[PDB]
Design a binder for this molecule. Sequence first.
Ligand SMILES: NCCc1ccc(O)c(O)c1
Ligand SMILES: O=C(O)CNC(=O)C(=O)O
Ligand code: NI
Ligand SMILES: [Zn+2]
Length: 330
Amino acid sequence: AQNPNCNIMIFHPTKEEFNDFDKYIAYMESQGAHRAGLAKIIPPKEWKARETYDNISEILIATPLQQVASGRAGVFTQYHKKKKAMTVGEYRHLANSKKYQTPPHQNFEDLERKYWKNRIYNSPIYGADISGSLFDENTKQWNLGHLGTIQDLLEKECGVVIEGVNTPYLYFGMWKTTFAWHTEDMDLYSINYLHLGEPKTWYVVPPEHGQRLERLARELFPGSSRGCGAFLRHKVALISPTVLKENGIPFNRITQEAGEFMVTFPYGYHAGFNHGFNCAEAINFATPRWIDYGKMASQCSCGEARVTFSMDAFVRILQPERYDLWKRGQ
Ligand SMILES: NCCc1ccc(O)c(O)c1
Ligand SMILES: O=C(O)CNC(=O)C(=O)O
Ligand code: NI
Ligand SMILES: [Zn+2]
């Protein structure tokens, strides 16, 4: 069995290998990459996402989110307070201001230490889930706006025709902006390209051990766990690497830099933070191997979790027993 220790693998495809997206995902899995829950893909040197990021300042962040924490340094939740709209230009200036800028630090490890020590005492502002793309339409390889759709995958695999679209989202981050522990909707894959700016650090639990993280989360957030059978779907819980180690949860970490792709695999729990001002683009996708994970995905029905339009059809077709109860909560 490939990659039995579930290490995060890093890939360096040639420009030839970078032509067929599906084929290369399949190749990575043949080498055991999915066992980690997360992989890094470094594009061939000949490739670029777009010519420049010169005039991105006029993009609007309609609903910036202030991420307010509660709890202790290693175990906390965050809630999102809506702020007034601002342009990416205004947001970048805010990120670089004395209140919000990255502190002096020696290296990634020093900065990681500072993050887990001090995150809860600040409330950084995130521009998340902004529908759009920064890939040039003429970029033919690994263009996250030109992927095959999950709806077409389901149709090809299972012969069912369904409504729905899926499109990419932009994320503008600053120092300490945080993504909570989660898997994707319907335990899909995700792919994330860091277009510009400072790094993003990721933590990930191997899919074969996801239930260990769920069990720990129930112990660490007991009220939340009583309110919902799948509260990690709410995407508000953080647990530090120190606390994960103390409780024997298997995980790995890696830092993504500008110009690099990350792929998360079905039921790979992940969390992380941004080092400073940056812009990433991400989208969910499916492969034939996803279908079984989609059928088994645990759902939030307390009503807290957000659901796009397109998730309806996934639940309706793959989880018809759950559909009625789930739809009551959307
Ligand atoms: N009960 C279904 C599985 C499960 C358990 C705990 C969680 O936090 C979660 O998101 C999902
Ligand atoms: O970049 C972020 O803030 C979060 N991204 C993801 O969880 C992802 O790409 O799957
Ligand atoms: Ni994700
Ligand atoms: Zn819920």
